Design a protein around this ligand. Structure first.
Ligand SMILES: *C(=O)NNC(=O)[C@H](Cc1c[nH]c2ccccc12)NC(=O)OC(C)(C)C
Length: 220
């Protein structure tokens, strides 16, 4: 695999969004991965509606602002036959009744692929597919205050994740501890968090924060 990857430079990634206080991280991670695969297919980057997923993908197993799973979102887009654009179905950060309109659908998928639970397999998928939806243990104050550098939390759990995010690449930089590799991760807490809304999460450190434990992407 390459030593560094960044799908933003290939046009695969929309700007950082903000989920607000709604527990809709799974919808932002899913739209991010579908934005990437739709761009891969059509050459057009179109921001997708997280509110569409929050309001409408309950029958696939999601629970709106109380949480959800990216794979359930991908299943919804397949079952539903479409997904509306962000512009047509904007984000309200609260659960409401479903308002999907097929006339404004701009994305589809035919299922999803679950990556094996190893960082080596996540690296291969990131290098060859595009941005990948992942779940991480983000439940630590160090994650809230992250400013720059490679994020490493000694209390992070590799098995108990609470937050869906999007791996858009990976790379390296020299560090004091010589733990130099990172996953380049797009969050959904706005631009003021982290590095413009991004975090470099420790890579190849025993599946830090569980980043390779629930990785997947839609098939387009
Ligand atoms: C985000 O704003 N809130 N978190 C979530 O929605 C949870 C994210 C999560 C945790 N573990 C995951 C594995 C695979 C995909 C997403 C994952 N989701 C969550 O708590 O889901 C319910 C248990 C269904 C509520």
């Amino acid at each position: 695999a390459p030593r560094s990857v960044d799908w933003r430079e290939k046009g695969y990634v929309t700007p950082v969004k903000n989920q607000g206080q709604c527990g809709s991280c799974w919808a932002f991670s899913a739209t991010g991965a579908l934005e990437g695969q739709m761009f891969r297919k059509t050459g057009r980057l179109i921001s997708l509606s997280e509110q569409n997923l929050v309001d409408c993908s309950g029958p696939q197993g999601n629970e709106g602002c109380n949480g959800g799973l990216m794979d359930y979102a991908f299943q919804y887009v397949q079952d539903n036959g479409g997904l509306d654009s962000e512009e047509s179905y904007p984000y309200e950060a609260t659960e409401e009744s479903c308002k999907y309109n097929p006339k404004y659908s701009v994305a589809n998928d035919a299922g999803f692929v679950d990556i094996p639970k190893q960082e080596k397999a996540l690296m291969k998928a990131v290098a060859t597919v595009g941005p990948i939806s992942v779940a991480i243990d983000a439940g630590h104050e160090s994650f809230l205050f992250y400013k720059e550098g490679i994020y490493f939390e000694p209390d992070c759990s590799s098995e108990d994740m609470d937050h869906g995010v999007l791996v858009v690449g990976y790379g390296f930089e020299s560090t004091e501890s010589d733990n130099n590799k990172y996953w380049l991760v797009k969050n959904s807490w706005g631009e003021e968090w982290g590095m413009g809304g991004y975090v470099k999460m420790a890579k190849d450190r025993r599946n830090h924060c569980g980043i390779a434990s629930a990785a997947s992407y839609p098939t387009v």
